[PDB]
Amino acid sequence: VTTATLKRQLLQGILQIDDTAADVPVTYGEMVLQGTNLVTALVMGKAVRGMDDVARHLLPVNARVPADLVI
Amino acid sequence: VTTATLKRQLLQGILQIDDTAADVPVTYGEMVLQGTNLVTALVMGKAV
């Protein structure tokens, strides 16, 4: 991240531009806190994020956008 | 629960017998602590 003047200073002779477009995710992840780590949120004061998996261990679409990628 | 002579003085003319047989449970309860109360015991320090 730069200012406009330094970016114009950098794109002239120093850094060579790779691609003028990139494809980036378009969705936030989510955390819901229901099920096994809802009772422990209310009977005790704790909770674990992957409480569906970490209890088991014991016993997507993107979009192409205009960008400016340098090497 | 008494001593052996208190029984002799109580069963004589004071306390009235009703029945001479009884049925009782013959197996204890059980606690296993496995499943999701094992994870709660190992990660945090509690269990229900």
Side-chain angles (χ1 to χ4, degrees):
Chain A
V1 185
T2 88
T3 72
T5 304
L6 305 174
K7 184 189 183 189
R8 273 174 312 176
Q9 193 142 56
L10 282 185
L11 278 193
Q12 283 171 21
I14 317 179
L15 313 162
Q16 56 181 34
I17 306 96
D18 178 18
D19 288 331
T20 49
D23 53 338
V24 310
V26 286
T27 40
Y28 293 72
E30 298 168 20
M31 279 184 36
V32 65
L33 191 130
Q34 40 76 32
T36 41
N37 57 19
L38 176 77
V39 286
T40 69
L42 289 196
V43 61
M44 46 210 74
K46 321 292 193 44
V48 189
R49 184 167 190 190
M51 198 44 169
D52 56 21
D53 296 323
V54 306
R56 181 268 328 153
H57 189 181
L58 278 164
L59 63 85
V61 63
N62 56 275
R64 170 161 306 180
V65 306
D68 200 305
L69 270 45
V70 288
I71 302 179
Chain B
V1 282
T2 83
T3 69
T5 190
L6 291 193
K7 187 153 185 152
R8 301 198 100 267
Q9 187 166 333
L10 288 178
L11 280 193
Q12 190 171 9
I14 297 169
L15 287 205
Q16 196 61 261
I17 188 65
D18 186 75
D19 187 290
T20 63
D23 64 351
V24 303
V26 293
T27 187
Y28 319 94
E30 282 143 29
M31 312 182 45
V32 306
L33 202 141
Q34 56 180 89
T36 191
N37 44 356
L38 162 66
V39 180
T40 303
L42 299 187
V43 179
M44 50 220 80
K46 283 106 186 164
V48 189

